[PDB]
Write a protein that binds this ligand. Structure first.
Ligand SMILES: N[C@@H](Cc1cc(I)c(Oc2cc(I)c(O)c(I)c2)c(I)c1)C(=O)O
Ligand SMILES: N[C@@H](Cc1cc(I)c(Oc2cc(I)c(O)c(I)c2)c(I)c1)C(=O)O
Ligand SMILES: N[C@@H](Cc1cc(I)c(Oc2cc(I)c(O)c(I)c2)c(I)c1)C(=O)O
Ligand SMILES: N[C@@H](Cc1cc(I)c(Oc2cc(I)c(O)c(I)c2)c(I)c1)C(=O)O
Length: 560
């Protein structure tokens, strides 16, 4: 019995949580209460199978079981065409209501009145809004979330206790989700082989001391865990993750020095820890790379004889000695190495042909460096806000067809690269920046894929996972784009507009800025400022009240 197998390994609590998430991620619109039930029904059924492994229907597969329940066009199908359906219907941008937070005390009263339905609510909302969220990590969040309510709903200043914590959690959660989406997207759109090279590059950087054989073992298990969470097999994913978590800590020595701290803590805490671990120190006298990959005579022999291993070795070797290189950069290098061998080994004298292969990397290594240098200079200069506006303008000219909410969204996060990476030494900027940009550009890709409107986005997004950043960067202003006419509907007054926070204000102002650029593509940084200002002055004036609605309306109609 598979149900019981999992129930036994994860325990009832985690099992009930994981199953809830599984349902919330498959049916994002359904009411909270409805899901809960299904869980209860399913959780009980497992218990019986735990009792009688031979009980009725305990021989079923988790997908069949869960699917059937969910069905009480997708349902009218059968396994596995039926499950592929639910996956295929996950909405990365559901039309769900805003999930704002009530009044501190209002929540607490609920956190107390009924504590289990409270957390189930948490796991429920997050899961439905992020159908790809990493189940395990979400449990970790669930705890940290409950903690806050247990240490803040009982103290002097609570809204000054809780809130600050609730902030940091939504941010970490958003980063987590964005991170897992890249992983699922990597797998689904480019295959596991693409994901494996990627993970190989990442672990070789975090574990330079580790042996290639060890890193491979980790990547294989790691590939299995993510395929599962990405494909809905949450229960098995949580199970398999814990095994790996346990494995890593046991062989901790032959892997990384930084795992020591991680291993002492509880399951969830130590898994999150490993997931966040910093690069171990890099071994000293390491044999030059050229020796085995350029100078050797067996280069072509090994390529033919075992390309997959040989190339994996190349990635592993290069990555481990270059923590100063973004993983996508290394992947390009690996790709270049292969192309060069693909041609060279057919050539007359292979040794001469692939002899200067390191030469061809130089260009590929400098490109990311200069760019990172440039925007960090620009950042020290403009600051987060003014920086995002620079990007916002830049990217709206590249892909005008893309809707405003998304352009503002993506540009904002592209702007956070600066505050999140430039406060680092050269040696640690590229991996920070370029690998962070991969996450943000993937948000664009997945959000744009639900209703494509720009071939330029689609081409860059689908052509290669590794060239995305170069692809977007290289993009010139879309000239075929026809200016969006003026539509006052965008700025229709709304009471809330005058009583906005600094964050909310900037988003309105940035929305305005995109709408402006979309309307006058050929504007100047200067003439854009002018317009933004007059408008800013207008809104500020009209907010200084009297009859607000009239000023905005009266004076607005005048501007329009
Ligand atoms: N920028 C990437 C780099 C990165 C990728 C992987 I693959 C990885 O290995 C794990 C192991 C476990 I256990 C997890 O639960 C997770 I998530 C990732 C680690 I460490 C770092 C990221 O941080 O995603
Ligand atoms: N004033 C600078 C020009 C400059 C403007 C921007 I806006 C910028 O920021 C990005 C960030 C990303 I991410 C891209 O993909 C791209 I293209 C540009 C950078 I770096 C440089 C000079 O003259 O030196
Ligand atoms: N219709 C929206 C409300 C809304 C009104 C205005 I007027 C507006 O325009 C600006 C322009 C600048 I420049 C600012 O600094 C600010 I604040 C607002 C925007 I964007 C949105 C709703 O229904 O929610
Ligand atoms: N009189 C013109 C219409 C027009 C109205 C406005 I108000 C305006 O100014 C802004 C400012 C911001 I900020 C925006 O995001 C946008 I869109 C337009 C511009 I330029 C032109 C005609 O019909 O010929």
């Amino acid at each position: 019995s598979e149900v019981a197998h999992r129930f036994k390994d994860l325990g009832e609590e985690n099992f009930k949580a994981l199953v809830l998430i599984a349902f919330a991620q498959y049916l994002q619109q359904c009411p909270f209460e409805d899901h809960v039930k299904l869980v209860n029904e399913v959780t009980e059924f497992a218990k019986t199978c735990v009792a009688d492994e031979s009980a009725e229907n305990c021989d079923k597969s988790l997908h069949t079981l869960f699917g059937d329940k969910l069905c009480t066009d997708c349902c009218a199908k059968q396994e596995p065409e039926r499950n592929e359906c639910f996956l295929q219907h996950k909405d990365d941008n559901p039309n769900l209501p805003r999930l704002v937070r009530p009044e501190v005390d209002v929540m607490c009263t609920a956190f107390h009145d009924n504590e289990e339905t409270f957390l189930k609510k948490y796991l429920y909302e997050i899961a439905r809004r992020h159908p790809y969220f990493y189940a395990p990590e979400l449990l970790f969040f669930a705890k940290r979330y409950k903690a806050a309510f247990t240490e803040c709903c009982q103290a002097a200043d609570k809204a000054a206790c809780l809130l600050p914590k609730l902030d940091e959690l939504r941010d970490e959660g958003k980063a987590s989700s964005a991170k897992q989406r890249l992983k699922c997207a990597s797998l689904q759109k480019f295959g596991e082989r693409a994901f494996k090279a990627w993970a190989v590059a990442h672990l070789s950087q975090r574990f330079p001391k580790a042996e290639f054989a060890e890193v491979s073992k980790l990547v294989t298990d790691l590939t299995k865990v993510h395929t599962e969470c990405c494909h809905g097999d949450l229960l098995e994913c949580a199970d398999d993750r814990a095994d790996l978590a346990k494995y890593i800590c046991e062989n901790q020595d032959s892997i990384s020095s930084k795992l020591k701290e991680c291993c002492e803590k509880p399951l969830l805490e130590k898994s999150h820890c490993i997931a966040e671990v910093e690069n171990d120190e890099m071994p000293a006298d390491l044999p030059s790379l050229a020796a085995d990959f350029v100078e050797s005579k067996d280069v072509c022999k090994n390529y033919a004889e075992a390309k997959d291993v040989f190339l994996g070795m190349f990635l592993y070797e290069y990555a481990r000695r270059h923590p100063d290189y973004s993983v996508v950069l290394l992947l390009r290098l690996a790709k270049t190495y292969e192309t060069t061998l693909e041609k060279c080994c057919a050539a007359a004298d292979p040794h001469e042909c692939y002899a200067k292969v390191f030469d061809e990397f130089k260009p590929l290594v400098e490109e990311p460096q200069n760019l990172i240098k440039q925007n960090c200079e620009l950042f020290e200069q403009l600051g987060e806000y003014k920086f995002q506006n620079a990007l916002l303008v830049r990217y709206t000219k590249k892909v005008p067809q893309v809707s405003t909410p998304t352009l503002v969204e993506v540009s904002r996060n592209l702007g956070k690269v600066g505050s999140k990476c430039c406060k680092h030494p050269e040696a640690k900027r590229m991996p920070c920046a370029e690998d962070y940009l991969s996450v943000v550009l993937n948000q664009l890709c997945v959000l744009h894929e639900k209703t494509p409107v720009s071939d330029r986005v689609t081409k860059c997004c689908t052509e290669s996972l590794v060239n995305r950043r170069p692809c977007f960067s290289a993009l010139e202003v879309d000239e075929t784009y026809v200016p969006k006419e003026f539509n006052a509907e965008t700025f229709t007054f709304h009471a809330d507009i005058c009583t906005l926070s600094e964050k909310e204000r900037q988003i309105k102002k940035q929305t305005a800025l995109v709408e402006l650029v979309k309307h006058k593509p050929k504007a100047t940084k200067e003439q854009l400022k002018a317009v933004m200002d007059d408008f800013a002055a207008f809104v500020e004036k009209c907010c200084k009240a009297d009859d607000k609605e009239t000023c905005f309306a009266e004076e607005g109609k005048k501007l329009v």
